[PDB]
Design a protein around this ligand. Structure first.
Ligand SMILES: Nc1nc2c(ncn2[C@@H]2O[C@H](COP(=O)(O)OP(=O)(O)NP(=O)(O)O)[C@@H](O)[C@H]2O)c(=O)[nH]1
Ligand SMILES: [Mg+2]
Lengths: 178, 539
């Protein structure tokens, strides 16, 4: 047995809590309640080895900035989350999340996760952004950010559909091993 | 409110007998090899029998007290060593006390008798403190413990209702003007759901301005309600764990990475710092392992002392002692009002006359009346001082000042500050000096100005009503003293007390030997040769 500490960071309402509930209990929560410092646990097999993956959910609100670095010590892998539909959450990776993670943990690996993949191709979501004069974050746009922040791997996933979600946590353990 | 943490007689006695030791010096190994073990113990055994000789013991104390090297510290220590050695012979202990008191009265009659028993700089003075403590233990347990604990919990409850600075010690609610938090800081009360992971939730009333350590202290008082300090765990061994949702896992501390640091200052982490809300589940889990700190108000370090003027007298009053502003005095007078019920109850129980008065109090006050009578002292004020400097200012005042002598509790700097004001009021109640009041007058006199006259009348009627009742005979007292000796099982350090007493005999041997040889009765009793046999047996 080899326990791995994992901290999921990102902007408000990006889909961090949803991503963790959809992976652990295999069901989507739906109801939106802003989390403060929730914790989740799941035992997953990666490369024929038993891993007791420790999940740490953080608050996306700038009001809870003070308590956030308490989850950071002794962490094995980080997950910077941004919404693929919201370009403000993508810009917040460079301006808020990446320098905050490196300030407390400069030798801990980071993986850039593009939350809400199902809403990227949806007709109703694009119309809402077209009126606000905003364009959704494509794969080469998100990959360029992951290279800029020095992330080991870039993955896109959706909590509602479960597409790519199983790969996100699988590649997370792989980063710790090497 | 069930559970009063009364100290067991052993701990009570040890704390009172050896106040400046932390741990009883009698609880140690002799430091003598096993070869000399039978010969030394036999010598110490013979010393115990020699201490039973009234002529020896009286001459032994008198010789020691005439020496320059035998300090006040020695005088108080030797008196406590004799107390432990003669704890089983309290009838005889009191006979030795009586003899030494008569010697003291005789000395003070020819000087100023109003100055007798004012301090604890003689053997007889410390012996009286120990004597009062032995007799009054049950009285404190049976009647005085209930109001005294009510005052302690009372202050603790009221001080907790407002902010307290972890660094400076300044509190919103206090009786001392010097400990008052002059700046009104922004604070909000919070009711935390406390858990003990060492389980069911217990509600704890705290404030957002409290430090993690301050929160932890308030948590432990409810999670260990009717539990004494000795049974309670060390606060440093426990961590404060805040938990939200399904699983929390967050550890809060006074100093960590989240700490607010600006320049040469570092603010201590509060509950408001982490943004802990009302109703939040906080658990106590075990610990698994330049820049100046501040909490509420930044400490004002002033280079205030200037070089004084040539002719200027300075004075510790009138100019330096500025009249307390009404804004701060109202805050102190409001605090006095909250603790009034507890203060009044305590002083009523201590000075109760309708309730049975302990025989020890009656007997000793009858002895002081008799000592004044034999020496022709008619001045009632002189007799008043004598009684005051036996029992209120010898025993009671120290118990008020420090509850750790009686209870198994922890005492904060502000708790000690509040109790001091109360103790000073109790002192003014027994004192005969009339104070006019004004400006530079002490804090206790200003706060208890409306109550002191009534308290003075309580002490006045206490001595008077005790006098009016049938005198207490020695036959009447030594009966209670005999059962007091039998009641206590032992293990107070008598063997080690005899060894520590020999060290003083070894120090002043030649001086003691002359006193035992100059006296005719001592020569016939062969007390000198007896002391030589013990000296030869030990070394
Ligand atoms: N269609 C779709 N909706 C999602 C997805 N992820 C999250 N949502 C929705 O977007 C909202 C945010 O969910 P949430 O997990 O709480 O985001 P969060 O970042 O953890 N909030 P916080 O920053 O306060 O911790 C919810 O209303 C949720 O139903 C997704 O992958 N697909
Ligand atoms: Mg959340």
């Amino acid at each position: 047995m080899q326990a791995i500490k994992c901290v999921v960071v990102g902007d408000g309402a990006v889909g961090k809590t949803c991503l963790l509930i959809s992976y652990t209990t295999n069901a989507f929560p739906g109801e939106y309640i802003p989390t403060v410092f929730d914790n989740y646990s799941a035992n997953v097999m990666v490369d024929g080895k038993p891993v007791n993956l420790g999940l740490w959910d953080t608050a996306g609100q700038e009001d809870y900035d003070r308590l956030r670095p308490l989850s950071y010590p002794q962490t094995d892998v980080f997950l910077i989350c941004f919404s693929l539909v919201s370009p403000a959450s993508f810009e917040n990776v460079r301006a808020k999340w990446y320098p905050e993670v490196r300030h407390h943990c400069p030798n801990t690996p980071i993986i850039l996760v593009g939350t809400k993949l199902d809403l990227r191709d949806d007709k109703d979501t694009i119309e809402k952004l077209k009126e606000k004069k905003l364009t959704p974050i494509t794969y080469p746009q998100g990959l360029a950010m992951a290279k800029e922040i020095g992330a080991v791997k870039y993955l896109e996933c959706s909590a509602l559909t479960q597409r790519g979600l199983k790969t996100v946590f699988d590649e997370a353990i792989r980063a710790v091993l090497k | 409110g069930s559970g009063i943490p009364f100290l067991d007689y052993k701990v009570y006695a040890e704390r009172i007998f050896f106040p400046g030791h932390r741990e009883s010096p009698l609880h140690r190994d002799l430091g003598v090899p096993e070869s000399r073990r039978p010969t030394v113990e036999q010598g110490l055994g013979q010393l115990s029998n020699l201490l039973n000789s009234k002529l020896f013991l009286t001459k032994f104390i008198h010789t020691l007290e005439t020496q320059r090297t035998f300090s006040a510290r020695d005088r108080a220590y030797v008196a406590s060593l004799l107390t432990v050695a003669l704890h089983g012979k309290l009838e005889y202990f009191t006979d030795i006390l009586r003899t030494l008191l008569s010697d003291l009265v005789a000395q003070y009659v020819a000087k100023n008798p109003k100055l007798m028993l004012r301090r604890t700089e003689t053997v007889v003075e410390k012996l009286l403190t120990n004597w009062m403590s032995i007799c009054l233990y049950t009285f404190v347990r049976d009647s005085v413990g209930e109001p005294l604990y009510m005052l302690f919990r009372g202050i603790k409850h009221q001080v907790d209702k407002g902010p307290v600075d972890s660094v400076t010690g300044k509190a919103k609610y206090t009786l001392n003007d010097n400990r008052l938090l002059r700046e009104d800081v922004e604070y909000r009360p919070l009711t935390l759901n406390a858990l003990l992971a060492v389980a069911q939730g217990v509600p704890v009333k705290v404030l957002d301005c409290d430090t993690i350590s301050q929160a932890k202290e308030k948590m432990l008082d409810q999670l260990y309600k009717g539990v004494p300090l000795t049974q309670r765990p060390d606060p440093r061994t426990l961590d404060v764990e805040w938990r939200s949702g399904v699983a929390g896992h967050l550890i809060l501390s006074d100093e960590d990475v989240t700490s607010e640091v600006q320049g040469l200052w570092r603010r201590l982490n509060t509950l408001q710092h982490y943004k802990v809300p009302d109703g939040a589940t906080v658990a106590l889990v075990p610990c698994l392992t330049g820049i100046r700190p501040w909490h509420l108000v930044k400490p004002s370090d002033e280079p205030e002392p200037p070089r004084p003027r040539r002719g200027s007298l300075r004075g510790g009053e009138r100019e330096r002692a500025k009249a307390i502003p009404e804004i701060y005095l109202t805050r102190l007078l409001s605090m006095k009002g909250t603790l009034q019920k507890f203060v009044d109850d305590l002083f009523q129980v201590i000075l109760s006359t309708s309730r049975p008065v302990p025989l020890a109090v009656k007997y000793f006050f009858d002895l002081l009346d008799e000592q004044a009578q034999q020496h022709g002292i008619s001045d009632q004020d002189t007799i008043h001082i004598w009684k005051t400097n036996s029992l209120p200012l010898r025993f009671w005042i120290n118990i008020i000042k420090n509850p750790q002598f009686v209870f198994d509790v922890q005492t904060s700097d502000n708790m000690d500050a509040v109790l001091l004001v109360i103790a000073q009021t109790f002192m003014d109640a027994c004192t005969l000096a009339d104070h006019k009041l004004g400006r530079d007058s002490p804090i206790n006199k200003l706060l208890y100005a409306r109550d002191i006259p009534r308290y003075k009348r309580m002490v006045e009627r206490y001595y008077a009503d005790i006098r009016q009742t049938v005198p207490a005979s020695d036959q009447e007292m030594n009966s209670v003293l005999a059962e007091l000796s039998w009641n206590y099982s032992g293990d107070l350090g008598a063997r080690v007390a005899l060894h520590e007493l020999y060290k003083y005999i070894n120090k002043y041997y030649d001086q003691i030997i002359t006193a035992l040889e100059e006296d005719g009765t001592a020569q016939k009793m062969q007390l000198g040769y007896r002391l030589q046999q013990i000296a030869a047996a030990v070394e």
